[PDB]
Amino acid sequence: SGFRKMAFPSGKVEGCMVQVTCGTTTLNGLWLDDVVYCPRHVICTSEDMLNPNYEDLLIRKSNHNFLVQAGNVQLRVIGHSMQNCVLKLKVDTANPKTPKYKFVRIQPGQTFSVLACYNGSPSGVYQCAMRPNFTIKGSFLNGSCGSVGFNIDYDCVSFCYMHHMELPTGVHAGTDLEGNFYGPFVDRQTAQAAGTDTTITVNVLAWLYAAVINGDRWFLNRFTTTLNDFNLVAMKYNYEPLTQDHVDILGPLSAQTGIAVLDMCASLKELLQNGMNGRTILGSALLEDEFTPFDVVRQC
Amino acid sequence: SGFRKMAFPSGKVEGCMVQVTCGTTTLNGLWLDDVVYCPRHVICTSEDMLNPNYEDLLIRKSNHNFLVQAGNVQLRVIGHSMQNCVLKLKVDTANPKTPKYKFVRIQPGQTFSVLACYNGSPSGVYQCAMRPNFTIKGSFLNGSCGSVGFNIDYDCVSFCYMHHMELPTGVHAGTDLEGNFYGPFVDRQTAQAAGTDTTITVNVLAWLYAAVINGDRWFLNRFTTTLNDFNLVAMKYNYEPLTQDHVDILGPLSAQTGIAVLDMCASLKELLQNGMNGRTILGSALLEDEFTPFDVVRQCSGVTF
Numbered sequence A: 001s002g003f004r005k006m007a008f009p010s011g012k013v014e015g016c017m018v019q020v021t022c023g024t025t026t027l028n029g030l031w032l033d034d035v036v037y038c039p040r041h042v043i044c045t046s047e048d049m050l051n052p053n054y055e056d057l058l059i060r061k062s063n064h065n066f067l068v069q070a071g072n073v074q075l076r077v078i079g080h081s082m083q084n085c086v087l088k089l090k091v092d093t094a095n096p097k098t099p100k101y102k103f104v105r106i107q108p109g110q111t112f113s114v115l116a117c118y119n120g121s122p123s124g125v126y127q128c129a130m131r132p133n134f135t136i137k138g139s140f141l142n143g144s145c146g147s148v149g150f151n152i153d154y155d156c157v158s159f160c161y162m163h164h165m166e167l168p169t170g171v172h173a174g175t176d177l178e179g180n181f182y183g184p185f186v187d188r189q190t191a192q193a194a195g196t197d198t199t200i201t202v203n204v205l206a207w208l209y210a211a212v213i214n215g216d217r218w219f220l221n222r223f224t225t226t227l228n229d230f231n232l233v234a235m236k237y238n239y240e241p242l243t244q245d246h247v248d249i250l251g252p253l254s255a256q257t258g259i260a261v262l263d264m265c266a267s268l269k270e271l272l273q274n275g276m277n278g279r280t281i282l283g284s285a286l287l288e289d290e291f292t293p294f295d296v297v298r299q300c
Numbered sequence B: 001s002g003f004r005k006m007a008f009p010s011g012k013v014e015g016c017m018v019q020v021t022c023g024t025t026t027l028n029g030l031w032l033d034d035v036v037y038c039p040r041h042v043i044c045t046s047e048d049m050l051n052p053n054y055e056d057l058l059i060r061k062s063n064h065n066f067l068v069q070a071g072n073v074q075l076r077v078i079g080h081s082m083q084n085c086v087l088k089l090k091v092d093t094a095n096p097k098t099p100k101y102k103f104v105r106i107q108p109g110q111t112f113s114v115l116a117c118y119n120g121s122p123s124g125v126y127q128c129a130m131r132p133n134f135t136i137k138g139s140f141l142n143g144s145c146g147s148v149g150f151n152i153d154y155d156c157v158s159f160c161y162m163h164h165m166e167l168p169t170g171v172h173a174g175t176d177l178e179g180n181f182y183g184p185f186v187d188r189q190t191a192q193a194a195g196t197d198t199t200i201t202v203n204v205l206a207w208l209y210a211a212v213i214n215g216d217r218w219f220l221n222r223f224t225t226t227l228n229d230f231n232l233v234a235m236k237y238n239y240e241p242l243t244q245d246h247v248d249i250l251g252p253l254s255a256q257t258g259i260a261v262l263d264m265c266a267s268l269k270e271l272l273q274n275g276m277n278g279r280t281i282l283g284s285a286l287l288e289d290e291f292t293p294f295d296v297v298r299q300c301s302g303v304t305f
């Protein structure tokens, strides 16, 4: 029993965190096998950030302009290349702590653990979701660039996010480990803004199923809804559309609790209309949307 | 920017988790130096749990009745003894991954990270507070016993909790690493209940300071209060009393934000009396009490381990 926002154990990722310095800029890098991945903006000074020409800035660097520190040991950089917005530094030592890993690009609504780091040293771990507007609501201070997001389903680390930037609203933007940004963001200090964010409907439904599994039913009602009527209502509260894929994904939770997906949708419609009336669901007075259907099954 | 419920990095503790099996029961153990610590109820059948005589149950076991597995390697148990509600299994190999550590007993209101484990394998990490009623609101399934709670202070892991039991309300009870329960709980399958809980006032104030640091100021007001008047309000709303020690601990956050502790108390009094009026603080519609003043300072300053 209980239901917490739970992160994956971070040890496998801690053993990969290094500090990358280029000139006056220092940030984090991810050391896997003989390559250190880090945001390409490590080659910029604050005066290069409006319209950096990364190819031009990079061609001017030699391997010895990149200082990589793993613990108290300096690694030797023997090659460098850029892939999209990530810089890949080939080093002369394979990381002995490299876990089994893969790089995965995630979709909005997906969750992952973030190991926030400064100067190549882990500070804490928390759970995040890729918002529908392609930002993450992280907790990152200056120096956190290069910190990564990951999942560890079945002993293999799937790296899905590398932190690059903080937007004016205090939310965060980054890339997958192939250096492709999530959303329409660019690694430039030009004016950028997070688009209007919305609630991850399929995750709210998964979390209502978690509440039923954990013994709470107060929010259920005798009604059902069509999928289209549900979407017409939910969109009025800035909820993401629920697709037939989402309905299918909620199938196992529906079978376990005995509550049809569209019957849970009718409960959600009523919660949006009424609020909670002084009650809570799984210790929350708001509808939680950063648990996926997969997370609920894993935790419950 | 941003403020998340953040756990300590768990790697130092992951390297200590092992699986302990005694007969049909399998749970987790913590392997530090040449000793594996686990709940003493690993030796009980469900019927023994109704009214266990742990000394009598233990004298019937040999070292070979405890199967300890660290990853895919079986450790050799060469001794066994009980300390309060923990069983200590001496093994023939010191854990090469033993971090610098200490065993500390925490007080209600203190937070810690929990590394939830099953079959000696870490599954998740989350941040908990020891409630005023000595329970923790954890997330634990069958097989999670022996999972531990900890903090990291510099490069030293301070182990403060070992999981033993789930209570009927779905909250959790356990011991420190010396086997002393937090709360009036016993390791027996007999009627037990979590007592009425209260809110950790000093932690709510710390989280209001975190909200101010992150730009959420709507709840600030021109008023101040006295510690006695505030405590009359805290008592009325099932909040823990705020002491001068709590006020002193919040000193740095008060100096940074420019909001005196009793000025923030006046904000909290108004929130208790009026609610949030449709608003949220740090994405919450409830007053959060599982961040200590130290957690707020640490998260807002980026301390690493």
Ligand SMILES: Cn1c(=O)[nH]c2cncc(NC(=O)[C@@H]3CCOc4ccc(Cl)cc43)c21
Pocket (backbone or CB within 6 Å): A041, A049, A140, A141, A142, A143, A144, A145, A164, A165, A166, A167, A186, A187, A188, A189, A190, B001
């Ligand atoms: C400077 N800084 C903070 O104070 N809190 C941060 C949390 N995360 C990230 C950063 N920094 C950034 O966002 C940098 C500096 C500003 O401009 C840009 C523009 C583009 C890119 Cl890719 C990176 C950055 C942080």
Ligand SMILES: Cn1c(=O)[nH]c2cncc(NC(=O)[C@@H]3CCOc4ccc(Cl)cc43)c21
Pocket (backbone or CB within 6 Å): A001, B041, B049, B140, B141, B142, B143, B144, B145, B164, B165, B166, B167, B186, B187, B188, B189, B190
């Ligand atoms: C059995 N079980 C679950 O289903 N979810 C659990 C989460 N945490 C703990 C346990 N288990 C317990 O509580 C066991 C079994 C029940 O009886 C008692 C009585 C006293 C003590 Cl010390 C331990 C236990 C879990």
Ligand SMILES: [Cl-]
Pocket (backbone or CB within 6 Å): A105, A106, A107, A110
């Ligand atoms: Cl995905």
Ligand SMILES: [Cl-]
Pocket (backbone or CB within 6 Å): B249, B252, B293, B294, B297
């Ligand atoms: Cl402090």
